[PDB]
């Protein structure tokens, strides 16, 4: 989108940044007066004022100041200094807007003639650059596009000075053609490599010393930010006169910037009432056009649209902003939220209405006092869940809130909102049945939304042969034919796609618009594509006029970025045309008809099928061109097509505001071309009624001359014969009437309505419609992976950290689902510390390192470790506490689990030591019965377990209570003890061993240190010595 | 019940060519079981079906037994023989 | 067996299960050694048909973030003395936030630079000993025992509530084994 930058901005970016032999003047050498600023400052860091004179104008993207008297020419600093007063921060009107003063730019006084008054224009066309050079410039510089000498600079081609002063310089001054060619040459490397698209110097002053550019007005592409982003820097986008910023639409650019959906808002009238809530770019236009339409345009508040399938956090958060907007003021009527919108081809009405309805609940208060009225109407994937949480949150917030769906015709909303009805070479054929394409990118539903389509339509094959991805290897992946399941090629390269898929003519490129330019590009390489499909939005102009100048060459016919694509009922569908299957079968698009449309808007396309299907026999075929500058390809392009296929009858055309493409057509039906039945409706009424120069959603949707308005454009198509409604409302009433016009003479012969096939139901939706029941073969009770944050048990991962626990905490929460004591969880760290590792002698360990010898890997070397962990290693906790525990539990005293203990040949489990006895303790030991001591509240089984150490102690003095049986009585203690559990859960978490997880989960950081180490020190492969094994083989078996 | 009238439409998440459990006979890679046995193929046979889905040469599967039988064991002085005897000497 | 269970369920963990720590610690400290400002590493990252390790979300974005990326984060902010790779891998996700919401820093990616940053500032290591620690895999270690907890939590969760043998429906495998081999 060409956005206007301020005065001071381009001779600031053209001083930096042009190159030319020429030594340019006045480098940097301006000021800026605000009335939000000092004066003493501006005279210290621009000293040059009084060195020189001075000249003053508001910088405010305001043209004709000469003329209206804002520009005081010849005046010294005091002089400029009581200019500014009377004008300063007053009130001006210049046209039709009327507005203050916030901006005026001081720059020196040149002294110059008449003589030496030029000017010089370069503006971006579909062609090239136009670049006018006149001799007579300035105020007298008169009609420029029929005195000034005009040359077509061709898309990559270079401005050659010879060219210059030939065509552009025939009545210059000799003296000074050679350095003037020099900086035209400049210039034009400074509007193409900055990517201008409107450079006009008016008067350029070139005397002796050098050049001056006294005015400039410049657009620059906004939507090559990516590209010139050192080079602009902060660059800042003034409004038009009369227009004032806000931060919240400053907000909503970043948003937009932020992704490749797309996020417009424009605040026109914050005093008004009406706000909406439209998708789409040319639904937002017709809403507004109907808004106007009734006598709501002084009331209408702000133009917004949110498109390219916007996620919910995005239009929650421009639902926030806009709701944050309609709260400030109140208004003794009411206010109006309009959230309306096409049938929406891919948007998911359910995600985007959910975040619209997270922030109506977020500003419930504020609109149920200022008595706001919803009105909803949206058609698309998912609308049903959409008008369904729209309608709960209109009851439970106590918002009146109206929702309604298809049936409606997308105007009766605006109405009755305000009080008006009661409230309810290139080839002709691009596809074809047998036509195969290749899809760039991983878009898995839209594929399937194309089978289902190709299934539904009777095909033979599938219309998708091969996707490409270049962030993945080649492989196979599943889709649907029907109910059968078949698999799709995903190829890396475009290179392998094309050599296996000859047959593919057509490429529907999903590239973001950072990345289509070089894949369309990389296509063109390849003569089998015909067609090829830009869906991206944001796509630089200049990229875009590169990518049509190689189509042409190649013959390459391609639907212009920004667009969701288009449908040929029965044989062939463009991405996400269309919506889903239930509306594919909704507007009977699975077989052909008799009416043909092209349409700048992809929303506005599925309102001219549904509106098509319900009125006519039915869609031929439906292209959308996108929203862009410069489409891939025009409405002409498309309407000849048309015209020479005899399956079509009648054509509608749905043009928007801005460019002379429909006197095209006008000249076409003209001169005889066009002889089939042309109904054309342009949206875009509302910009006649506005008092601004709002720029729409849509980046071509601009009105540069006058020409060019929508109400033009239908007034000649109905002097050109063009069936042309009154609005957009008799749209369906006037393609109506010639749909019966057209079939009582017999031109038109509908066709037996023979039923689609039948698609079975996806799981997924009749899951959530609850229509089917399938059990769950899982059940999960220690974490919660799914929803906005994770959940340990019960808890969300946040307050599990501002409650600081630690490794107990997580551990209690994760294995007992439990909230444990300070003391249970530090514990259990400290058990988990004391069981981290014991040399490597160990099973475990001494299997780790032969597994980390073997380089294998650090998850096998540690499973192989762990895998040794059992009865005769490691055990010892479990087997000691469920020991401990019976005894306990059966009521026998120390002394004689002792005598049955020896009596049944068995040994104590955590009784012994090698070395350790007393006087010389574990010192592992002691430590965690000294905090067992100190916090514990009860230990019966460890005073149980002392006692018996008490008894085997006085038998032989290594017999003590090892780490692993102390361990094991604690934590029984521990279990049994603390409130968290009863005795049943206790006992139950013994028996099914939680302790082999303690010891397992304490040696894991040891075996992992232990391989760590192995792969640090470099070891080599080990070979046990064959002294150390004794073979005893048998003599011979 | 909606799936044996084919009313709803459910993904399968897994892929498999070696071995058809369901059915009246075990399938190995398209061959019945009996048909397996029938044909005298042994442990190199279901090894090149499980594995290649392939029916294999005579000589193939047999030469896949011997490189079976020379790989059998080494002695226990290497990695994995000595990591099996200390994990089994643990008992577990 | 609860070993059994365990083991199974950690054998799993490797490239494209539990190796995002390690593969987004490695790619972020090749790239800052490598002197290539973010946005070239985010345009060498493309041109090479790979996806920046431990950058990208499934739901949360912005203005909704990780809540464990965030925690992680304001520690090592209010903590580490220094962190240059955690500010170049800021600075990469704010670019790839520049092209679609959901490409943050992941918790992976965040944890995989800060544990570069604490190895390799801190005065314990030389950068020899941290680049040495990173290359044998100290994360991989890291995040198998953080993970070996959520498992053995899942093994008692279902040795508690009892549950039966699992056998895989046959509706959810596709079977296309050739006609006769
Ligand atoms: C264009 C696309 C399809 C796909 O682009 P996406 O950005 O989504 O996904 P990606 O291709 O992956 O690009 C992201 C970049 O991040 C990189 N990346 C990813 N992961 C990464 C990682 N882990 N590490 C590093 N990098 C990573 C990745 O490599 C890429 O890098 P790059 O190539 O340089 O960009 C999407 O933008 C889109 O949908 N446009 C819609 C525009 C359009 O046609 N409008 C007209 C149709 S009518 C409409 O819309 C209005 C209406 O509402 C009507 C109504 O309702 O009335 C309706 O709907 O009909
Ligand atoms: C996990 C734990 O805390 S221990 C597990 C708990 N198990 C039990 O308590 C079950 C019942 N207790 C017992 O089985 C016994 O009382 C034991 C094993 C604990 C007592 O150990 P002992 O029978 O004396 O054998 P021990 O392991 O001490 O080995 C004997 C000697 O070899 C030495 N030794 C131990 N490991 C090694 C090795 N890798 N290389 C060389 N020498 C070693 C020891 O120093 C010890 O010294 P000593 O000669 O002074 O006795
Ligand atoms: C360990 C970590 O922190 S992740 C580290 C991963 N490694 C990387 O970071 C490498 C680079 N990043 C990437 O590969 C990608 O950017 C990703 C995978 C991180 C981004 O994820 P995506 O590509 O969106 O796939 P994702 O995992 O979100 O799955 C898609 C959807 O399935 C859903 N989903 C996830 N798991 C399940 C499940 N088990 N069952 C059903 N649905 C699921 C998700 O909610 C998600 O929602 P969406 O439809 O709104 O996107
Ligand atoms: N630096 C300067 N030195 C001398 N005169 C200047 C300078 N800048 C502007 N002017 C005067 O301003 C007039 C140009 O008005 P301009 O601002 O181009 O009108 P508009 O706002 O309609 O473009 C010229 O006639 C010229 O005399
Ligand atoms: O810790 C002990 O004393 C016994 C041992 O070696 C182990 O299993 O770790
Ligand atoms: O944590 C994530 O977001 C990715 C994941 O599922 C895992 O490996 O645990």
């Not at 008809?593 to 506005?604: C, E, H, L, P, Q």
């Not at 307050?799 to 259990?828: A, D, H, N, T």
Request: proline share 5%; net charge neutral; aromatic share 8%.
């Amino acid at each position: 989108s060409a956005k206007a930058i301020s005065e001071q901005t381009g001779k600031e970016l053209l001083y930096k940044f042009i190159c030319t032999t020429s030594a340019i003047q006045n480098r940097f050498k301006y000021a800026r007066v605000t009335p939000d600023t000092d004066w003493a400052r501006l005279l210290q860091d621009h000293p040059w004022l009084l060195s020189q004179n001075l000249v003053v104008k508001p910088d405010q993207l305001i043209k004709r100041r000469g003329k209206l008297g804002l520009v005081g020419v010849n005046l010294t600093l005091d002089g400029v200094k009581s200019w500014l007063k009377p004008r300063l921060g007053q009130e001006a009107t210049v046209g039709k807007a009327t507005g203050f003063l916030k901006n005026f730019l001081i720059e020196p006084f040149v002294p110059h003639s008449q003589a030496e008054e030029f000017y010089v224009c370069i503006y971006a066309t579909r062609e090239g650059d136009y670049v006018l050079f006149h001799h007579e410039g300035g105020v007298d510089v008169g009609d420029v596009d029929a005195k000034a000498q005009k040359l077509l600079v061709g898309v990559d081609e270079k401005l050659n000075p010879e060219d210059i002063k030939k065509h552009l310089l025939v009545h210059a001054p000799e003296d000074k053609k050679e350095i003037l060619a020099s900086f035209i040459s400049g210039l034009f490397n400074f509007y193409e490599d900055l990517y201008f698209t409107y450079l006009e110097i008016n008067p350029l002053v070139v005397t002796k010393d050098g050049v001056y550019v006294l005015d400039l007005a410049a657009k620059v592409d906004a939507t090559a930010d990516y590209i010139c982003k050192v080079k602009w820097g902060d660059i800042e986008f003034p409004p038009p006169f009369g227009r004032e910023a806000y931060p919240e639409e400053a907000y909503i650019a970043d948003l937009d910037a932020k992704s490749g959906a797309s996020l417009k808002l424009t605040l026109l009238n914050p005093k008004g009432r009406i706000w909406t809530m439209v998708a789409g770019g040319g639904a937002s236009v017709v809403y507004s056009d109907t808004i106007c339409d009734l006598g709501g345009v002084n009331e209408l508040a702000n133009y917004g649209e949110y498109s390219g399938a916007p996620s919910e956090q995005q239009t929650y958060d421009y639902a926030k902003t806009i709701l944050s907007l309609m709260t400030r003021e109140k208004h003794p009527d009411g206010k109006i939220l309009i959230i309306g919108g096409s049938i929406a081809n891919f948007t998911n009405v359910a995600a985007t209405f959910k975040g619209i309805v997270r922030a109506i609940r977020d500003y419930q208060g504020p609109l149920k006092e200022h008595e706001v009225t919803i009105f909803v109407r949206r058609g698309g994937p998912n609308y049903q869940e959409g008008l369904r949480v729209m309608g709960e949150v209109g009851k439970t917030t106590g918002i009146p809130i109206h929702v309604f769906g298809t049936e409606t015709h997308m105007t009766a909303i605006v109405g009755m909102a305000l009080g008006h009805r009661p409230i309810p070479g290139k080839s002709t054929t691009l596809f074809s049945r047998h036509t195969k394409a290749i899809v760039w990118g991983m878009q898995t539903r839209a594929v399937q939304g194309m089978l289902d389509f190709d299934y539904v339509c009777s095909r033979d094959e599938p219309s998708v042969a091969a996707m490409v991805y270049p962030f993945t290897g080649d492989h196979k992946q599943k889709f649907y034919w029907g109910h059968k399941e078949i698999l799709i090629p995903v190829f890396k390269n475009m290179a392998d796609a094309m050599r296996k898929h000859p047959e593919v003519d057509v490429l529907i490129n999903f590239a973001s618009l950072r990345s289509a330019y070089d894949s369309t590009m990389e296509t063109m390489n390849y003569a089998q594509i015909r067609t090829i499909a830009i869906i991206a939005e944001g796509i630089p102009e200049a990229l875009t006029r590169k990518l049509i100048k190689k189509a042409d060459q190649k013959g390459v016919t391609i639907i212009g970025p920004a667009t969701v694509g288009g449908i040929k009922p029965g044989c062939f569908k463009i991405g996400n045309t269309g919506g889903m299957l239930d509306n594919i079968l909704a507007s009977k698009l699975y077989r052909p008809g008799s009416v043909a449309y092209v349409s700048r808007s992809g929303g506005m396309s599925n309102e001219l099928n549904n509106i098509i299907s319900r009125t006519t026999d039915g869609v031929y075929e439906g292209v959308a061109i996108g929203g862009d500058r410069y489409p891939g390809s025009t409405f002409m392009d498309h309407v000849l097509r048309y015209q020479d296929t005899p399956g079509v009858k009648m054509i509608v055309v749905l043009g928007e505001i801005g460019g002379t493409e429909e006197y095209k057509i006008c000249r076409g039906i003209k001169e005889g071309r066009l002889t089939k039945p042309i109904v054309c409706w342009c949206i875009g009424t509302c910009a006649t009624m506005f008092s601004s120069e709002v720029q729409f959603g849509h980046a071509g949707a601009c009105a540069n001359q006058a020409s060019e308005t929508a109400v033009a454009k239908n007034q000649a198509l109905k002097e050109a014969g063009v069936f042309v409604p009154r609005s957009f409302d008799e749209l369906g009433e006037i393609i109506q009437s010639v749909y019966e016009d057209l079939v009582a003479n017999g031109v038109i012969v509908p066709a037996q309505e023979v039923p689609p096939p039948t698609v079975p139901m996806d799981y997924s939706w009749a899951r959530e419609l609850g229509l089917i029941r399938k059990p769950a073969s899982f059940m999960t009770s220690i974490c919660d992976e799914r929803g906005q944050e994770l959940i340990y048990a019960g808890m969300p991962i946040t307050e599990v950290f501002k409650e600081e626990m630690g490794i107990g905490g997580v551990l209690g929460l994760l294995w007992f689902q439990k909230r444990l004591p300070k003391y249970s969880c530090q514990f259990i760290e400290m058990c988990l510390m004391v069981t981290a590792d014991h040399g490597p002698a160990v099973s475990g360990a001494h299997n780790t390192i032969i597994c980390a010898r073997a380089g294998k890997d650090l998850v096998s070397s540690l499973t192989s470790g762990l895998l040794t962990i059992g009865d005769r290693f490691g055990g010892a906790l479990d087997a000691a506490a469920k020991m401990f525990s019976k005894a306990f539990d059966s009521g026998i005293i120390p002394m004689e689990f002792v005598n049955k203990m020896k009596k049944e040949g068995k040994l104590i489990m955590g009784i012994g030591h090698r070395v350790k006895s007393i006087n010389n303790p574990d010192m592992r030991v002691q430590i965690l019965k000294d905090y067992v001591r100190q916090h514990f509240p009860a230990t019966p089984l460890l005073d149980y377990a002392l006692e018996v150490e008490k008894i085997t102690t006085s038998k032989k003095p290594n017999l003590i209570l090892n780490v692993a049986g102390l361990i094991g009585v604690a934590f029984v203690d521990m279990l049994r003890n603390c409130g968290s559990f009863t005795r049943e859960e206790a006992d139950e978490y013994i028996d099914i061993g939680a302790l082999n997880g303690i010891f397992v989960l304490g040696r894991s950081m040891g075996f992992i240190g232990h391989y760590l180490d192995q792969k640090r020190l470099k070891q080599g492969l080990y070979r046990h010595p064959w002294d150390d094994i004794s073979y005893v083989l048998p003599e011979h078996m």
